[PDB]
Tab-separated table of C-alpha atoms and ligand atoms in Angstrom:
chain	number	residue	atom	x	y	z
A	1	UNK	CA	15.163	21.939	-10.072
A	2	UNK	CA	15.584	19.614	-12.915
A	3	UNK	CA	14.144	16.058	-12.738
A	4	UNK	CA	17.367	13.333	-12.962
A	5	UNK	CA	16.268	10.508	-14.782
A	6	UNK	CA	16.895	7.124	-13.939
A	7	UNK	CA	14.265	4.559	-16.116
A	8	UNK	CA	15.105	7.022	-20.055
A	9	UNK	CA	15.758	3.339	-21.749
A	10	UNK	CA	11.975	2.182	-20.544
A	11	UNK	CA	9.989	0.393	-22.628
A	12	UNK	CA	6.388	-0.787	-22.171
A	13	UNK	CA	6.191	-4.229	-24.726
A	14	UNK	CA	2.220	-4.382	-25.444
A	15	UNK	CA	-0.115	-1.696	-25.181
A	16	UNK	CA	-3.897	-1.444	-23.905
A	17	UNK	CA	-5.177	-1.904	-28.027
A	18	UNK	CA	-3.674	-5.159	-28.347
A	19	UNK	CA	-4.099	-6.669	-24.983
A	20	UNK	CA	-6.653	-6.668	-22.395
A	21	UNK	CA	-5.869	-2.733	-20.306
A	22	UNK	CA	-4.501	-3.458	-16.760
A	23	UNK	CA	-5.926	-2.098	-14.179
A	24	UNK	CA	-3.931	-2.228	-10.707
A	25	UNK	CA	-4.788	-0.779	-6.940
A	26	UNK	CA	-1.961	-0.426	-5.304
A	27	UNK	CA	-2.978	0.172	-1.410
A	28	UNK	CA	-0.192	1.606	0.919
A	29	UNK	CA	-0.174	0.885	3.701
A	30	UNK	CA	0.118	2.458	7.422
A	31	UNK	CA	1.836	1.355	10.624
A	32	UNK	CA	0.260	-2.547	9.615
A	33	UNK	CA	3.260	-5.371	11.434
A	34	UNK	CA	3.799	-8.293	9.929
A	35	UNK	CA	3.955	-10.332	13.396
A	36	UNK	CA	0.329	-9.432	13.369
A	37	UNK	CA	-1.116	-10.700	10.593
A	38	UNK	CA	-2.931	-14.233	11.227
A	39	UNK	CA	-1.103	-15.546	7.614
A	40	UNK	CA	2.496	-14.895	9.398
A	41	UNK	CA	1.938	-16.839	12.305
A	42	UNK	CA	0.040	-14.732	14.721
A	43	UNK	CA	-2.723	-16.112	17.061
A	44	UNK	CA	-5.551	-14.005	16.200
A	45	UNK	CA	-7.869	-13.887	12.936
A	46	UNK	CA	-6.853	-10.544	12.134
A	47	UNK	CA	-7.852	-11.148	7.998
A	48	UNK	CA	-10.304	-12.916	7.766
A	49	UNK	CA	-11.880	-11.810	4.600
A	50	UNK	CA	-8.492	-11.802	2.769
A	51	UNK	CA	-8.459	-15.463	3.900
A	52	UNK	CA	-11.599	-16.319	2.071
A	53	UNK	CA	-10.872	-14.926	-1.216
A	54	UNK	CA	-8.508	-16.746	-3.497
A	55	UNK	CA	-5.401	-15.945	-4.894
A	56	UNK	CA	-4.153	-13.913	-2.465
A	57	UNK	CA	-0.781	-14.232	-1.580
A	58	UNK	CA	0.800	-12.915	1.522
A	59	UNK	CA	4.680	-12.925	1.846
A	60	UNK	CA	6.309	-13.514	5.125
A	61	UNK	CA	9.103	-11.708	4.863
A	62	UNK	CA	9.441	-8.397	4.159
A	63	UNK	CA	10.982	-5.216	5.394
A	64	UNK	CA	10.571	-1.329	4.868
A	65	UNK	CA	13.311	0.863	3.916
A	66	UNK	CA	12.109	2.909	7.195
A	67	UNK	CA	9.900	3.809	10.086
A	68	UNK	CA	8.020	6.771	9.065
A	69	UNK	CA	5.854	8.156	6.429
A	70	UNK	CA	8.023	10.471	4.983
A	71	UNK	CA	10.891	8.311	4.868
A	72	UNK	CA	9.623	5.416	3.580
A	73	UNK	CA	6.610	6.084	0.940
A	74	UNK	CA	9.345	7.950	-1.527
A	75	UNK	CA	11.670	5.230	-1.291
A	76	UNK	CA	8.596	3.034	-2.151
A	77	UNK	CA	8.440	4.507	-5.380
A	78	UNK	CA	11.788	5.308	-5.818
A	79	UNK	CA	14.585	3.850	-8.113
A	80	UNK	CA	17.366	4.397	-6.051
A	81	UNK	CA	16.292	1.809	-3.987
A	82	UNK	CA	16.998	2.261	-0.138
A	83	UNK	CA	21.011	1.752	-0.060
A	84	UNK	CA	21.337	5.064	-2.123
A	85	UNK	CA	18.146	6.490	-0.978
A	86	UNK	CA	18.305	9.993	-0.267
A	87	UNK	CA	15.467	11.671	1.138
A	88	UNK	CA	15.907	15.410	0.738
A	89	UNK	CA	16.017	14.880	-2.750
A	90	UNK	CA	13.926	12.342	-3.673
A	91	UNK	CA	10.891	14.465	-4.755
A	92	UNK	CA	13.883	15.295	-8.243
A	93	UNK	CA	14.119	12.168	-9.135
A	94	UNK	CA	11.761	10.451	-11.606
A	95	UNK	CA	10.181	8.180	-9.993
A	96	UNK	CA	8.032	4.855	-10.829
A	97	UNK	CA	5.194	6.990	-11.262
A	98	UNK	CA	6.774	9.503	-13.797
A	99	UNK	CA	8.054	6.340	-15.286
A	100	UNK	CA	4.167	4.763	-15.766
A	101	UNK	CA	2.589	8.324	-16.481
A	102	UNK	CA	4.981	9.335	-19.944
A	103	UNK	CA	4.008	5.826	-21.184
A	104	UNK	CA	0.685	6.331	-21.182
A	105	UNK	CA	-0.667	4.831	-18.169
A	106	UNK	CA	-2.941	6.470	-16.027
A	107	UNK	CA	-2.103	7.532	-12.684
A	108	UNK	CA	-4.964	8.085	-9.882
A	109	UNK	CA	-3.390	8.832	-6.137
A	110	UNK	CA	-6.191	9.272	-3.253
A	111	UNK	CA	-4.895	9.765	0.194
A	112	UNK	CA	-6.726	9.074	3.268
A	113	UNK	CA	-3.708	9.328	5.488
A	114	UNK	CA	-1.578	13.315	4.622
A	115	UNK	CA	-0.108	13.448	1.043
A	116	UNK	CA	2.142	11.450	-1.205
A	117	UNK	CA	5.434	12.834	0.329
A	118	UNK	CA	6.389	14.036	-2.865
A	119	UNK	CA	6.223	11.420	-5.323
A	120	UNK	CA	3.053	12.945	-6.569
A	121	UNK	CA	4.375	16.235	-7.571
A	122	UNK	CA	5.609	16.252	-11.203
A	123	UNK	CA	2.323	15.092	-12.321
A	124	UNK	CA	-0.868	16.918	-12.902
A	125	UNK	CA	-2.204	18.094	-9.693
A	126	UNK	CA	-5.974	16.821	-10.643
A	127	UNK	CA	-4.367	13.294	-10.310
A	128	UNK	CA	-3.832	13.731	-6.613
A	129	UNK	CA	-7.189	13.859	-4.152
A	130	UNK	CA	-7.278	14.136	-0.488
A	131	UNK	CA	-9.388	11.591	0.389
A	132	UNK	CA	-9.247	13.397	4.602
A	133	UNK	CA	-11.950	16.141	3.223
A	134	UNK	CA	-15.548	14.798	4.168
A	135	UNK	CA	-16.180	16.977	0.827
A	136	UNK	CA	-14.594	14.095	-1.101
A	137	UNK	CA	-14.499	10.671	1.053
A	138	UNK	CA	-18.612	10.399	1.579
A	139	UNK	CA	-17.383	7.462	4.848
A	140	UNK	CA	-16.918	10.153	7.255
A	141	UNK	CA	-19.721	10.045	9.611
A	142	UNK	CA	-20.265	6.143	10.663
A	143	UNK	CA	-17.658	6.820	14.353
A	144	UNK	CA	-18.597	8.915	16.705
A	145	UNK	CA	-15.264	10.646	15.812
A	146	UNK	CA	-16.304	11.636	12.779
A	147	UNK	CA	-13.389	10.115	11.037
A	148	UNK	CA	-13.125	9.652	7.330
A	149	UNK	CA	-12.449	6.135	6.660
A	150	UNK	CA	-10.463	4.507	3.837
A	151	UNK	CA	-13.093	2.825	2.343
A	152	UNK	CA	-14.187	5.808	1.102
A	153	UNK	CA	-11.898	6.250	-1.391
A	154	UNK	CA	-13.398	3.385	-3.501
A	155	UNK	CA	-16.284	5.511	-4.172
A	156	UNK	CA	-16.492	6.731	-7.572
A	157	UNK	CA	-13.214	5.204	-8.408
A	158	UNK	CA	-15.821	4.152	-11.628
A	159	UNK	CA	-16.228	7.533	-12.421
A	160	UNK	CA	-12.079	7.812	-13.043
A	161	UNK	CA	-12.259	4.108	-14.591
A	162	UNK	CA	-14.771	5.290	-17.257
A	163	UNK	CA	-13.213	8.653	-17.685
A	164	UNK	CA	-9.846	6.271	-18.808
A	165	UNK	CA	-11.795	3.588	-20.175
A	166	UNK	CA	-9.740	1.080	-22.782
A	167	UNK	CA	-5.844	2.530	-20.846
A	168	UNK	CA	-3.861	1.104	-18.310
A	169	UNK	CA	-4.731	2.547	-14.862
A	170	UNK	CA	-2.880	2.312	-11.493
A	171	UNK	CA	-4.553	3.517	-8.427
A	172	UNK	CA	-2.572	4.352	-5.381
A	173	UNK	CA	-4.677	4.293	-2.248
A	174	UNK	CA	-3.461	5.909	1.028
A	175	UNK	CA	-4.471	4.558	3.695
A	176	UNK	CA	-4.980	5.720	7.169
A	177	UNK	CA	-5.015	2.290	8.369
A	178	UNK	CA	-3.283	1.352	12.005
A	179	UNK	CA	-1.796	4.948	12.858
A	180	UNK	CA	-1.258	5.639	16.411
A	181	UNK	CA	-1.306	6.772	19.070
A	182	UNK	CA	-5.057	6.661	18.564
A	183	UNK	CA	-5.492	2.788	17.362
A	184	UNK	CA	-9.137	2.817	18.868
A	185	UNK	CA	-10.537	5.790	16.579
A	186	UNK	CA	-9.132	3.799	13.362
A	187	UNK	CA	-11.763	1.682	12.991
A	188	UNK	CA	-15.894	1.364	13.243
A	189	UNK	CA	-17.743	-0.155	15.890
A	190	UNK	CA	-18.850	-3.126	13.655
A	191	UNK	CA	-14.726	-3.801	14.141
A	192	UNK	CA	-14.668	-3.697	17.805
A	193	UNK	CA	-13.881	-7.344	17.952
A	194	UNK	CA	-11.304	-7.854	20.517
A	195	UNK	CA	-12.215	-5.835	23.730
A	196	UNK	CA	-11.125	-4.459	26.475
A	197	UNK	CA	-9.922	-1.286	24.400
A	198	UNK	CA	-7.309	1.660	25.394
A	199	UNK	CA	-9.249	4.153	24.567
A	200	UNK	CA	-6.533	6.620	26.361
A	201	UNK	CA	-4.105	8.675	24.261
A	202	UNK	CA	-1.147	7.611	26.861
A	203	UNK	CA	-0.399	3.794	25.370
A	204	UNK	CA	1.935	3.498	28.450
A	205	UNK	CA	-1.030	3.950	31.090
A	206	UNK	CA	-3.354	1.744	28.951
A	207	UNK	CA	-3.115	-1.934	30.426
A	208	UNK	CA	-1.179	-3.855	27.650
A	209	UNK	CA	-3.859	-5.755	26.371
A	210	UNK	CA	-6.000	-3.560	25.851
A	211	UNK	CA	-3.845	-1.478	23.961
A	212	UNK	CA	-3.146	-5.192	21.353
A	213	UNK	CA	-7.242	-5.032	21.243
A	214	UNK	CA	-7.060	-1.855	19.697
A	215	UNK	CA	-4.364	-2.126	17.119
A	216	UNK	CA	-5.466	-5.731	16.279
A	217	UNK	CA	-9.347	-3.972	15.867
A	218	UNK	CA	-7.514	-1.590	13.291
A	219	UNK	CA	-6.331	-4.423	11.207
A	220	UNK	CA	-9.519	-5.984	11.115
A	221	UNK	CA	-10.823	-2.455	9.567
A	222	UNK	CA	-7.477	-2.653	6.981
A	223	UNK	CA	-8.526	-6.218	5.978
A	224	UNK	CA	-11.866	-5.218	5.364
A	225	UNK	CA	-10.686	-2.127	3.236
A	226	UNK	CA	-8.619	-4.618	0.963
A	227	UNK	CA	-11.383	-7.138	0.579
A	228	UNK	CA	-13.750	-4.489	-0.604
A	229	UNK	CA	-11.074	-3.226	-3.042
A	230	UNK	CA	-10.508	-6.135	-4.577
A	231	UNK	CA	-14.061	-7.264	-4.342
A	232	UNK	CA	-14.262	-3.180	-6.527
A	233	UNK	CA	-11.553	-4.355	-8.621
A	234	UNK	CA	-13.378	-7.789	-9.365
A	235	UNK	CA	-16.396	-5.510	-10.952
A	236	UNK	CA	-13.701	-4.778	-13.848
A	237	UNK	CA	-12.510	-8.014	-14.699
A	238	UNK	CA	-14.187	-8.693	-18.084
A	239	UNK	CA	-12.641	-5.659	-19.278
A	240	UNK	CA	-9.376	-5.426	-17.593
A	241	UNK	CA	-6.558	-7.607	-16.401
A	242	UNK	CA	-6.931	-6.374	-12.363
A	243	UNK	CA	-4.632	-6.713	-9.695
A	244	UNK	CA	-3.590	-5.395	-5.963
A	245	UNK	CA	-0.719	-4.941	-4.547
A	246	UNK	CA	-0.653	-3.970	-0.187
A	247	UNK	CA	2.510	-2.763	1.326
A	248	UNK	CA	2.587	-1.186	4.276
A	249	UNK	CA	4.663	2.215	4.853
A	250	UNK	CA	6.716	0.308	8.360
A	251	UNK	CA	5.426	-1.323	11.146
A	252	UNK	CA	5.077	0.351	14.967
A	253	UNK	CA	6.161	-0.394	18.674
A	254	UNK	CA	3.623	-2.089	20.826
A	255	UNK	CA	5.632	-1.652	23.984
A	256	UNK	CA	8.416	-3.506	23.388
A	257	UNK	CA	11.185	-2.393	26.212
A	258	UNK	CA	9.007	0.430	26.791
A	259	UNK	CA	9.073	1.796	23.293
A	260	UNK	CA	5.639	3.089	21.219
A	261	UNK	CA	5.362	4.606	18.048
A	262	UNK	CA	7.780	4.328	15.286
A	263	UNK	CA	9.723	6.492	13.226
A	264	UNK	CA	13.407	6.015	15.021
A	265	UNK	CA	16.209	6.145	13.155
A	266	UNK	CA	17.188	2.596	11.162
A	267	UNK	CA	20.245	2.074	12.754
A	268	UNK	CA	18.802	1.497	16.154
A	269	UNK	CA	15.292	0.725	15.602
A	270	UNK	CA	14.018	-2.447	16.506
A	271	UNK	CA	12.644	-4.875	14.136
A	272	UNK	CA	9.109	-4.441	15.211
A	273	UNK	CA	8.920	-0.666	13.455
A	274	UNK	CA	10.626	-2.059	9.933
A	275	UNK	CA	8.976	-5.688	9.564
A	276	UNK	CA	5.597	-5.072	7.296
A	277	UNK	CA	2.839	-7.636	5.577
A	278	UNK	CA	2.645	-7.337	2.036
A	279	UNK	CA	0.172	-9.131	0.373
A	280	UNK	CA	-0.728	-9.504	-3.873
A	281	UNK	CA	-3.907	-10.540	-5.337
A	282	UNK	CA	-4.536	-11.214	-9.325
A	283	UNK	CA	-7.303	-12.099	-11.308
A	284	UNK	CA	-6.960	-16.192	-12.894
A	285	UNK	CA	-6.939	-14.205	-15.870
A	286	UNK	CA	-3.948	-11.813	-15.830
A	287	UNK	CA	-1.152	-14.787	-16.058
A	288	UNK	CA	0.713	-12.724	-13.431
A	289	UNK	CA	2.913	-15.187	-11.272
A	290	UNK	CA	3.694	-14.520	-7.287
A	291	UNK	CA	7.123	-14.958	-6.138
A	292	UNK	CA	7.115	-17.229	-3.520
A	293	UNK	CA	6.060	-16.466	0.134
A	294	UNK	CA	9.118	-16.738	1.717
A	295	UNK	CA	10.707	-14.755	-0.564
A	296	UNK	CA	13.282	-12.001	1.571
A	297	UNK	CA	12.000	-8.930	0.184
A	298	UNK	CA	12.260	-5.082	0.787
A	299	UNK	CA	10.598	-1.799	-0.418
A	300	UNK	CA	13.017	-2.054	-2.985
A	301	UNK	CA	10.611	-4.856	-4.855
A	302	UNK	CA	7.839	-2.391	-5.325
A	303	UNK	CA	8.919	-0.337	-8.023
A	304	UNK	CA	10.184	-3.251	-10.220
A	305	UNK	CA	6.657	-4.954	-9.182
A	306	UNK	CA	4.527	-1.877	-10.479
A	307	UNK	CA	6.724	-1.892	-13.794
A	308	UNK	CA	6.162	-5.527	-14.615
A	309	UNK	CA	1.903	-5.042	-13.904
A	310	UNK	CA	2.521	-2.536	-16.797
A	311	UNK	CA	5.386	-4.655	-19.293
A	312	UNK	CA	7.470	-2.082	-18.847
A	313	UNK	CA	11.257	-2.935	-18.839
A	314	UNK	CA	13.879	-0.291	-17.057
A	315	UNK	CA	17.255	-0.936	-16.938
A	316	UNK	CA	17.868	0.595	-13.719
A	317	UNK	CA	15.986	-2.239	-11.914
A	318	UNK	CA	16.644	-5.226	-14.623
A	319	UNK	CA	18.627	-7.304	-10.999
A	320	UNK	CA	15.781	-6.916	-8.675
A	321	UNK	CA	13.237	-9.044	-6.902
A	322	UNK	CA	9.710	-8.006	-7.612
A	323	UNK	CA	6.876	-9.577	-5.756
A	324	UNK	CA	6.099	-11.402	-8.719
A	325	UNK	CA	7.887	-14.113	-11.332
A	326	UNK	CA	9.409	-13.265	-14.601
A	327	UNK	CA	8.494	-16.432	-15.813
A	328	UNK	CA	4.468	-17.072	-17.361
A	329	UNK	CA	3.066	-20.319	-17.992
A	330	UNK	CA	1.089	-20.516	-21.381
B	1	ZN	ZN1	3.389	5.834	8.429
């Protein structure tokens, strides 16, 4: 059926001939909990190359629209935001995407986790990959599981930047990251950092610990796939004004009265499956501002967020927080 617009009035201010093009990786994330990131208070070093690298920000407090995949990565990109949400009819709405795409920016979506839940579909099919196929992610045979990492999909990302060279760019990567119930096959050996592991796919039988070794070795593998994209998008910066944004999809159940997984309904699940790290790095270049990191933020800042990277202005959105400032120093 028809697409319903919601963004017609947008407007993007400058354009890639009279400014520097932008270039923007936006990594989403999977099952990642804020309560377990080092930055938000948690005992372990579970990013510790994001800690070396400046100007990343990390924001303390911020909540998905919902516990599972298909729920929550259209209402990422959504402009309904997730009071109005619906989600058997978000794949007809236009979408931040659409929005970025008929102004001339150029979209890129790998996937390294099952597909884009829709928000992919209105735009040309070339533009989505499946980064699972050990035809295209080349990181597939470094675990004895013969997993395809998410690292891969940085490879030939210059291939696409050169194809596009001189526009706007936005690169959504989608991550496999800390999906369960199989933490321990997430990540490679050189990650196997806190030990014992579960290495059992019944988390209940695993002793507790062993099963926080696991999902804490996962994030360790997710920090190192953000360091090494913006380490990729640091190769770029003479030419383009780069920046990442990392949200993850919702958080997961470690156990917590006997619960594991996620994806319960909002109304009763507990804060552990909807509390999720977000984290934004810029170049010193770009003039791009981060709100603060206390900031009480939602999904609902992403799409405004991805608009702003771009100048674009939509009306629909013109109230909300985005994870960065409206305000640029000169
Ligand atoms: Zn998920």
């Amino acid at each position: 059926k028809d697409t319903i617009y919601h963004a017609k009035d947008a407007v993007q201010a400058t354009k890639p001939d009279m400014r520097k093009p932008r270039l923007v990786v936006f990594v989403v994330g999977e099952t990642a909990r804020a309560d377990h990131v080092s930055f938000n208070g948690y005992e372990r070093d579970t990013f510790p190359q994001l800690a070396k690298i400046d100007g990343v920000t990390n924001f303390s407090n911020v909540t998905s629209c919902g516990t599972s995949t298909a729920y929550s990565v259209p209402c990422m990109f959504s402009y309904l935001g997730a009071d109005e949400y619906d989600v058997d009819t978000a794949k007809y709405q236009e979408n931040v995407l659409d929005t970025l795409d008929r102004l001339g920016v150029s979209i890129l979506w790998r996937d390294n986790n099952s597909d884009s839940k829709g928000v992919m579909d209105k735009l040309p099919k070339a533009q989505f990959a499946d980064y699972k196929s050990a035809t295209n992610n080349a990181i597939c045979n470094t675990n004895p599981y013969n997993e395809c990492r998410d690292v891969g999909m940085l490879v030939g990302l210059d291939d696409f930047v050169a194809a596009n060279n001189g526009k706007d760019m936005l690169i959504m990567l989608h991550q496999m990251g800390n999906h369960g119930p199989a933490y321990f096959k997430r990540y490679d050996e050189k990650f196997a950092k806190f030990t014992p592991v579960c290495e059992g796919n019944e988390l209940a039988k695993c002793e507790h610990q062993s099963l926080i070794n696991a999902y804490d070795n996962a994030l360790l593998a997710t920090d190192d796939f953000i360091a090494q994209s913006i380490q990729w998008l640091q190769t770029h910066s003479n030419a383009y004004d780069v920046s990442m944004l990392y949200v993850s999809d919702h958080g997961e159940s470690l156990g917590e009265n006997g619960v594991y997984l996620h994806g319960m309904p909002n109304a009763f699940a507990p804060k552990e499956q909807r509390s999720v790290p977000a984290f934004f790095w810029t170049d010193k270049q770009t003039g791009i501002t981060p709100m603060a990191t206390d900031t009480v933020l939602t999904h609902d800042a992403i799409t405004p967020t991805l608009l702003k990277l771009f100048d674009v202005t939509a009306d629909k959105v013109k109230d909300r927080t985005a994870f960065i400032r409206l305000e640029h120093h000169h």
